[PDB]
Every structure is written in structure tokens, then in C-alpha cells.
Design a protein around this ligand. Structure first.
Ligand SMILES: O=C(Cc1ccc(F)cc1)N[C@@H](Cc1ccc(OP(=O)(O)O)cc1)C(=O)NCc1ccc(F)cc1
Lengths: 90, 169, 104
């Protein structure tokens, strides 16, 4: 309940705080269906790992009490990351 | 009018930036930019009756402020600063900002002030109010790689989304 | 003060945060809560280097500048299999595709 497991299409398992995963409107609808586990049969680990870093960054930087830094995105992942982000609603 | 529709779009784009601070006083901007690196900027509503918007930007001497004029469907930097022919006009205020950021990024202008009185505006990174959506961050990244979005291997739904905000900042 | 980490073993990756003044042992207490293995059945690594349980994460090199939320630092994890600890083994993520010509 404190953590949830997100599994990529190539079998990588990402364990992240539930509050963080709820950054995704799609994940939120699934948990808030089904277990504390979501399988993404079409998102591979080089994309899902980046999505999880975005969750951490979004939760940390809702306020501007701290200068918000740049979220780096390699050009090589941006097209897939865009599609995953659209699918996840985040 | 088509003028009104272009102004409504300009304000929509502004709401997508993530660096539009809305109602923010000049002193609140001063405090917010005090510790930021040189060139950090934001856009906020102007307190002046005749202006919609004002850029606040960190200089090496501290934060300073530059109003944006809107006249007959066109934005440009405040013309008390320089002759208007040297202040490029834009239908879109985010486009205006993007232009000046890209001039600095391309090292066509730098932090040193010009010596012949042409426009001096050193902009590097925006100050975000909040983390933007991951979709918008991908959008910025794609925009920095290409302008030819309609040839991308994406569904038309996502090309429409890129087409809504073509700026690199 | 805060450092942001990925604790990685085989095809498991835990996203978690700690303080610069947190100890390695406190990190294993995080791992135990999640993966249900006690601290004496864990070895934590920065690159190829075993981390001593009594050190702070800063003493091992995990600083706020190098372990950020948008770019967390990676901590390697190896479990004890009966008498013996397993070799450290982190499975790579998939490789990204080649860029389309327009975005090169
Ligand atoms: O910045 C300041 C001083 C100041 C700073 C911090 C602070 F807390 C209070 C005042 N003076 C501006 C005028 C100004 C003031 C307030 C405003 O805000 P507004 O009344 O809300 O629109 C808009 C403009 C100014 O001398 N600019 C010349 C210039 C030309 C070119 C260039 F590239 C950048 C700047």
C-alpha cells in the first residue's frame, strides 16, 4: 500500500511510492479494477524508468519554494516518452 | 475578429508555458529572482494600466523588468527602450520570448550590452511556477529537435498536440 | 540534504529518497521493508564498491547535486543466498531506437 510495482513490456519491475504513481491519471483510475501491481505491456524499460523519474520530480516540485530545475529528456526517447505520457495522462 | 482570436490563442499559449506567474508584483518578482542565475526570466501581469504583461529577468546587477506592448494585434518589447523598428513584432507573446531566448542560445547576443543602442535582452532559462506535465516536457524536447512535426512517426492526435505549442521554451 | 536514488538488483528498481546524513544501514532498512530481506542479507554498492553500513550516504558520495529527483543516483543491491552472497548483477534497461532523420 505504501509502494506499487510497475512492470515494463520487457519485464523490468519498478517499485515506486503509491502517492508518486498517482501522478498518472491513468494509474490513478486503476488504483483509486485489478493487487498493487500494474503491467504496461507496451511501455519498455527505457521509457518506464524515465516516467518514474518524472513522478519523483513532479511530486517534489509542485511548490516553487525551490527553484524548479530542468527535467532532462534524451531526444532518442522523446517520441515514445510522449506517447507513454499521453497514455498515462501525466 | 481575427485579431480577437489571435489574442485568445496568445493567452492560451501563455497558460501552457508553466512560467507565467499571473498576478505578481514587481517586488514579488524581485524576491523570486534574487538568487537565480543571470538570464533567468519569468512573465507576469503588468501593474501598469496600459500594459498586459511584463518580463522579469535576473541581470548580474539584480532583477530588472521590461514591459511588453500590445498594439493592433502585435506584441513587442516596450518601445521607450529603443526605436520600434528594432523591436520585432509578434502575433504571439510566447513566440516573442522564444525569439529572444533563441538569439541568446545561438550566441547572436550575449550578456554584454551592445554599444550602438540596439536591443539588449539576455534570457536563458525560465522560472517555472510548477513542474509542467510530462507531455509538455516531451513537446519542448521535440521542438528543440525539429519543426517538421507533421512528418513524425506519431498519431495525428499527438501531432495536433505538438502543433498547439511549437516553441522551444 | 535530500538524495534521490534507484536501488537496483537484477530486473528490480526501487525509487526512493533519503537524507545526505542517512546511513547505508538505514537504506537497507528501506530495502527490507519493501523486498522483505533483512539488512544482514544485503550488500549495497556504489558502482563496484561495497558500501560500509555505518557510513552516511554523503560519505559514500551521494550528494544532492549528484542524486537528484530528475536524475537519481543508482545503488546496487545483492542478496545473500544461503551461505554465500550473490555477485552484483544489474540488468540493463532496453536500448532506445535510432532517431528519425528529421531529429538528428
Ligand atoms: O526594473 C526596473 C527597476 C526595478 C527592479 C526591481 C524592482 F523590484 C523594482 C524596480 N525598472 C524598469 C521599469 C519597470 C518597472 C516596473 C515594471 O513592472 P510593472 O509596473 O508591473 O509593469 C516594469 C518596468 C526599467 O527601468 N527597465 C529598463 C530596461 C530596459 C531594457 C531591458 F532589457 C531591461 C530593463
Amino acid at each position: 500500500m505504501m509502494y506499487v510495482k510497475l512492470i515494463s513490456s520487457d519485464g523490468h519491475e519498478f517499485i515506486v511510492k503509491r502517492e508518486h504513481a498517482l501522478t498518472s491519471g491513468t494509474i490513478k483510475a486503476m488504483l483509486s479494477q485489478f493487487t498493487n501491481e500494474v503491467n504496461f505491456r507496451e511501455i519498455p524499460s527505457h521509457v518506464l524508468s524515465k516516467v518514474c523519474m518524472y513522478f519523483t520530480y513532479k511530486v517534489r516540485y509542485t511548490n516553487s519554494s525551490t527553484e524548479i530545475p530542468e527535467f532532462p529528456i534524451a531526444p532518442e526517447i522523446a517520441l515514445e516518452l510522449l506517447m507513454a505520457a499521453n497514455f498515462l495522462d501525466c | 475578429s481575427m485579431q480577437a482570436a489571435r489574442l485568445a490563442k496568445a493567452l492560451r499559449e501563455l497558460g501552457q508555458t508553466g512560467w507565467y506567474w499571473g498576478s505578481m508584483t514587481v517586488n514579488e518578482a524581485k524576491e523570486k529572482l534574487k538568487e537565480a542565475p543571470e538570464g533567468t526570466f519569468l512573465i507576469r501581469d503588468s501593474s501598469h494600466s496600459d500594459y498586459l504583461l511584463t518580463i522579469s529577468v535576473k541581470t548580474s546587477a539584480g532583477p530588472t523588468n521590461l514591459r511588453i506592448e500590445y498594439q493592433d494585434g502585435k506584441f513587442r518589447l516596450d518601445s521607450i527602450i529603443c526605436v520600434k523598428s528594432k523591436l520585432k513584432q509578434f502575433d504571439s507573446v510566447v513566440h516573442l520570448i522564444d525569439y529572444y531566448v533563441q538569439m541568446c542560445k545561438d550566441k547572436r547576443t550575449g550578456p554584454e550590452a551592445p554599444r550602438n543602442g540596439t536591443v539588449h535582452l539576455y534570457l536563458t532559462k525560465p522560472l517555472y511556477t510548477s513542474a509542467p506535465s510530462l507531455q509538455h516536457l516531451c513537446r519542448l524536447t521535440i521542438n528543440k529537435c525539429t519543426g517538421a512535426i507533421w512528418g513524425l512517426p506519431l498519431p495525428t492526435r499527438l501531432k495536433d498536440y505538438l502543433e498547439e505549442y511549437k516553441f522551444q521554451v | 540534504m535530500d538524495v534521490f536514488l534507484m536501488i537496483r538488483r537484477h530486473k528490480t528498481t526501487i525509487f526512493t529518497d533519503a537524507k545526505e546524513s542517512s546511513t547505508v544501514f538505514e537504506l537497507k532498512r528501506i530495502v527490507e521493508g519493501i523486498l522483505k530481506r533483512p539488512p544482514d542479507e544485503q550488500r549495497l554498492y556504489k558502482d563496484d564498491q561495497l558500501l560500509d553500513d555505518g557510513k552516511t550516504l554523503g560519505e559514500c558520495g551521494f550528494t544532492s547535486q549528484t542524486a537528484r529527483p530528475q536524475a537519481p543516483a543508482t545503488v546496487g543491491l545483492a542478496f545473500r543466498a544461503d551461505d554465500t552472497f550473490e555477485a552484483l548483477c544489474i540488468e540493463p534497461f532496453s536500448s532506445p531506437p535510432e532517431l528519425p532523420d528529421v531529429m538528428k
